[PDB]
Ligand SMILES: CC(C)c1ccccc1Nc1nc(SCc2cccs2)n[nH]1
Ligand SMILES: [Co+2]
């Protein structure tokens with residue numbers, strides 16, 4: 001069948017063949033054809049996760065409006081996301097919590113229980129959510145606004161992101177992408193509420209390589225010059241994301257924490273403490289090394305877990321990821337896409353007709 005208005009038909013039931021739509025294929029800036037064909041089931045897994053992301057976001061953009069609480073926006077997005085991705089434990093599901101960072105806050109903000117924050121008409125909200133199939137994660141995000149005064153800011157970041165996406169490729173030095181991204185970003189000048197600004201990349205923020213069940217696999221893609229000359233290799237997966245800002249161009253820890261994630265390199269740790277032991281078991285069964293948030297714990301009937309979560313954090317078993325905000329009064333925007341460095345070409349797998 002086809003997709004229903006409010007989606008509900010999982011993406012695997014819409015492509016009975018098992019073959020999923022391919023992302024935009026780009027030529028980098030026979031044999032390495034067989035090498036690509038060999039990892040097809042993997043590429044395909046990424047694609048299924050991407051089609052889910054495209055349909056979920058198109059839905060969100062249809063109803064996101066000032067007046068709705070942040071909690072309402074995230075639960076509504078996630079419920080659709082679970083459906084289309086056809087959540088199945090760790091085989092299929094949500095790669096990470098729905099980021100909806102507001103204004104000066106650039107990333108990693110998702111509401112915890114009791115948050116009464118309401119989306120406003122002048123807010124610049126960054127929606128960042130991920131879907132995965134067998135750990136093949138799709139990290140893709142866009143910015144939402146209602147007041148056109150941000151229009152040029154959004155175009156700057158979007159243009160910077162696609163610039164980074166175009167400069168990416170096998171053997172491409174990582175610091176050149178960063179340099180490229182910045183040059184485009186700072187070529188934009190905007191005016192918001194009577195004041196003008198030259199958009200500046202958030203220097204301490206950046207794209208990253210992606211591994212199975214591992215959102216941030218190790219390498220970083222700067223969005224400013226002065227980065228590392230390390231090159232992108234064949235077969236790597238990257239999250240190309242840029243952040244524009246009218247503030248200082250640097251984020252810092254701010255607000256209450258909501259995102260958490262088990263340290264990928266830590267092994268089995270014996271825990272005798274009742275509640276801490278239980279919490280860890282819950283994290284291992286439900287999220288493994290995938291990031292989660294407090295709402296996803298309440299959702300599982302867990303309560304009285306804050307201290308256990310803290311214990312796990314102090315044990316280095318779980319790392320917290322607090323919201324990252326620029327200075328009060330500044331505005332930040334973001335655009336992100338996941339790319340596949342295949343042997344035959346560069347594929348912006350999460351590309352849509354929207355962005
Ligand atoms: C902030 C910085 C670039 C960062 C540090 C460590 C892990 C992941 C990310 N990136 C990222 N996260 C996301 S969405 C949700 C997540 C929250 C915490 C980890 S993943 N998009 N990009
Ligand atoms: Co992201």
Ligand SMILES: [Co+2]
Nearest residue numbers: 139239241336
């Ligand atoms: Co990312």
